Design a protein around this ligand. Structure first.
Ligand SMILES: CNCc1ccncc1
Length: 284
């Protein structure tokens, strides 16, 4: 029985290596990684791989791994797929811990923009969780943490993490991670998957996929949201993506809204993540 080596980058930056039968469906590998991580609340997570165009794709757990990675290496990342709107309602602290690790990478990477003060507050909870109570013996006036808190570090930010860290004495790791998440969940880009697109007029926009629906971003002043319940049908055709909207009260007809994606793979990818969000957050 022939086995393929899999490598998975975990959210702590370490690498998990295992073997699966070469005809294995994604669920097989996902189950191995989740067992490694001691993770029971698996529904919020998934594996990503990079396609021949170097685009991130979700590994479909129902489909053969070989038919998704195709010509590429069996190399994956473990990621949050569905960001819970209320992390306090997760059943296990360890689920919240992995969600914190994902959000820390969202922040450092710049995918999740964040004010100075919220960067310092999130950093202070991370430090409290991982090191425990503030110790002056470990930080002089010139302290620069090993912890990565932001896309760009300043001394002022390091100073502010330390000042807030002092305020958290007595806080336990689950308690600090819960505070981290109560702040992070409020950020306007929390759990938003962004896709470059053009509107039916050719104007460059971003489409955001999240718990609360499909968002449009255009020129800042020009924003729109389609809550998932309003969306009856998601479709793609060539380089185009469509949402069918329920008729409004007293309106005769449904409405279809159309967007142009970079290419056909990008339209199919946006379609699949929307359908998945629509189903997940309909049920959650
Ligand atoms: C040795 N590292 C290989 C790799 C694993 C996952 N993603 C990208 C590269």
């Amino acid at each position: 029985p022939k086995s393929m080596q899999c490598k998975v980058i975990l959210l702590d930056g370490s690498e998990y290596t295992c073997d699966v039968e070469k005809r294995s469906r994604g669920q097989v590998l996902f189950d191995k990684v989740c067992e490694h991580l001691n993770l029971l609340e698996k529904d919020y997570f998934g594996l990503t791989y990079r396609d021949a165009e170097n685009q991130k794709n979700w590994l479909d757990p129902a489909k053969e791994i070989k038919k998704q990675v195709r010509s590429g290496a069996w190399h994956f990342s473990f990621n949050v797929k569905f960001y819970p709107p209320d992390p306090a309602q997760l059943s296990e602290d360890i689920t919240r811990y992995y969600l914190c690790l994902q959000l820390r990478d969202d922040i450092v990477s710049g995918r999740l923009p964040c004010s100075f003060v919220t960067l310092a507050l999130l950093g202070s909870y991370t430090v409290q969780s991982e090191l425990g109570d503030y110790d002056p013996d470990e930080c002089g006036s010139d302290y620069i943490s090993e912890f990565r808190f932001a896309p760009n570090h300043t001394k002022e930010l390091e100073d502010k993490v330390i000042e807030l860290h002092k305020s958290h004495r007595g806080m336990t790791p689950a308690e600090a991670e819960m505070h981290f998440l109560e702040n992070a969940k409020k950020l306007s880009m929390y759990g938003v998957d962004l896709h470059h697109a053009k509107d039916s007029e050719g104007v460059e926009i971003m489409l955001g996929v999240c718990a609360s629906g499909l968002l449009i971003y255009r020129d800042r002043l020009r924003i729109n949201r389609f809550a998932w319940p309003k969306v009856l049908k998601i479709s793609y055709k060539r380089n185009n993506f469509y949402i069918k909207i329920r008729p409004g009260e007293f309106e005769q007809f449904e409405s279809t809204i159309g967007f142009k994606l970079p290419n056909h793979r990008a339209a199919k990818r946006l379609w699949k993540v929307c359908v998945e969000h629509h189903t997940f957050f309909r049920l959650l």
